[PDB]
Design an enzyme around this catalytic site. Structure first.
Site, mmCIF file in Angstrom:
data_model
loop_
_atom_site.group_PDB
_atom_site.id
_atom_site.type_symbol
_atom_site.label_atom_id
_atom_site.label_comp_id
_atom_site.label_asym_id
_atom_site.label_seq_id
_atom_site.Cartn_x
_atom_site.Cartn_y
_atom_site.Cartn_z
ATOM 1 N N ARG A 253 2.898 -1.014 1.515
ATOM 2 C CA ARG A 253 3.459 0.293 1.843
ATOM 3 C C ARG A 253 2.821 0.842 3.123
ATOM 4 O O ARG A 253 3.418 1.745 3.741
ATOM 5 C CB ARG A 253 3.332 1.309 0.701
ATOM 6 C CG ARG A 253 1.896 1.588 0.288
ATOM 7 C CD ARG A 253 1.672 2.647 -0.789
ATOM 8 N NE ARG A 253 0.239 2.671 -1.050
ATOM 9 C CZ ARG A 253 -0.318 1.816 -1.902
ATOM 10 N NH1 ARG A 253 0.452 0.949 -2.524
ATOM 11 N NH2 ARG A 253 -1.617 1.790 -2.114
ATOM 12 N N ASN A 254 1.665 0.299 3.535
ATOM 13 C CA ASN A 254 0.936 0.757 4.719
ATOM 14 C C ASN A 254 1.048 -0.224 5.888
ATOM 15 O O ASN A 254 0.282 -0.143 6.853
ATOM 16 C CB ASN A 254 -0.526 1.140 4.417
ATOM 17 C CG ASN A 254 -0.617 2.468 3.686
ATOM 18 O OD1 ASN A 254 0.184 3.379 3.929
ATOM 19 N ND2 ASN A 254 -1.603 2.588 2.816
ATOM 20 N N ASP B 140 -1.992 3.232 9.467
ATOM 21 C CA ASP B 140 -2.650 4.276 8.688
ATOM 22 C C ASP B 140 -4.055 3.881 8.235
ATOM 23 O O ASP B 140 -4.545 4.333 7.200
ATOM 24 C CB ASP B 140 -1.747 4.799 7.559
ATOM 25 C CG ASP B 140 -0.560 5.611 8.081
ATOM 26 O OD1 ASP B 140 -0.488 5.855 9.308
ATOM 27 O OD2 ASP B 140 0.280 6.011 7.263
ATOM 28 N N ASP C 53 -7.023 1.620 2.200
ATOM 29 C CA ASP C 53 -5.804 1.675 1.401
ATOM 30 C C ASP C 53 -4.804 0.604 1.862
ATOM 31 O O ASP C 53 -3.629 0.910 2.127
ATOM 32 C CB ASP C 53 -5.181 3.080 1.398
ATOM 33 C CG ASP C 53 -4.062 3.255 0.392
ATOM 34 O OD1 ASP C 53 -3.946 2.414 -0.527
ATOM 35 O OD2 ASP C 53 -3.271 4.202 0.573
#
Ligand SMILES: O=c1[nH]nc(-c2ccccc2)[nH]1
Length: 270
Positions: free
Chosen positions: A137-138, A151, A133
């Site tokens: 945002r990560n 993450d 992913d």
């Protein structure tokens, strides 16, 4: 000590100092471990995570050590809720950082953010570990402005089906190659595709990819062979790098090693 494995932190060793906001597993806080060491503390909302599977995987994740990967320090287990303890990144999420226009970024800083991420990903690729992913945002930003990848692999433990089904409302359609959207074929090359989209996010100062389209429209656009186009701040050579991540045939996409070489070439040239 006595009742603790190497992956396990004693929650009594934590001091809570500041709220950092809410993520998908719930509340995140800044604190200190044993009075001295800065940490981020994720409080995992009940029912959000496949916890026994995550805990087994935490053992593997703790051996992934690279200066551009946000370090996992351990887990506070056998309590409700469990806590995940990680390296504290004082400047927060990359997406929010890019969107703050006050920073007035130079393109050299933007390429350095891409290089930071690329180094982390080349390391993960060398360990045959998929992020699954990758997106702005990560990624997180420390007090020195260094970007690190966070993450990695965690999506495997998310119980909310809205996030995990390709048709779910919270699936990362806009970071996914055609073979993921069509038949759920995850590989090193789906991480490569996502990395290209992340370079686009960085050079676009945090715009949403395909911002005028819905997820359904995006999937149709991509599956028909069309792509994002060049952010104004990307030079032709930078655009060539991000675009190379989007070949329809997955085996024609580069590796993270090749991308890193290409990024360093552009840093030297530009
Ligand atoms: O895993 C981590 N480390 N640091 C954070 C953080 C999140 C939000 C805001 C500031 C830092 N999250």
């Amino acid at each position: 000590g006595l009742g603790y494995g190497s992956w396990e932190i004693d929650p009594k060793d934590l001091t809570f100092l500041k709220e950092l906001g809410t993520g998908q597993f719930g509340v995140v806080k800044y604190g200190k471990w044993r009075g001295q060491y800065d940490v981020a503390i994720k409080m995992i909302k009940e029912g959000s995570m496949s916890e026994d599977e995550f805990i087994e995987e935490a053992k593997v994740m703790m051996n992934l050590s690279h200066e551009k990967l946000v370090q996992l320090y351990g887990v506070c287990t056998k309590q409700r809720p469990i806590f995940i303890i990680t390296e504290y990144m004082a400047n927060g999420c990359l997406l929010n950082y890019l969107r703050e226009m006050r920073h007035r970024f130079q393109t050299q800083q933007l390429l350095e953010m891409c290089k930071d991420v690329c180094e982390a990903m080349e390391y993960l690729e060398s360990k045959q570990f998929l992020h699954r992913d990758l997106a702005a945002r990560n990624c997180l930003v420390n007090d020195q402005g260094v970007v690190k990848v966070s993450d990695f692999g965690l999506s495997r433990y998310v119980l909310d089906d809205e996030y995990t089904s390709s048709v779910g409302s919270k699936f990362p359609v806009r970071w996914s190659p055609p073979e993921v959207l069509m038949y759920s074929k995850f590989s090193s090359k789906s991480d490569i595709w996502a990395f290209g989209v992340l370079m686009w996010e960085i050079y676009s100062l945090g715009k949403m990819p395909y911002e005028r389209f819905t997820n359904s429209e995006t999937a149709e656009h991509i599956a028909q062979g069309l792509r994002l186009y060049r952010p104004h701040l990307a030079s032709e050579k930078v655009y060539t790098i991000m675009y190379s991540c989007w070949h329809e045939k997955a085996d024609e996409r580069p590796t993270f090693k090749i991308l890193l070489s290409n990024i360093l070439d552009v840093m030297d040239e530009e």
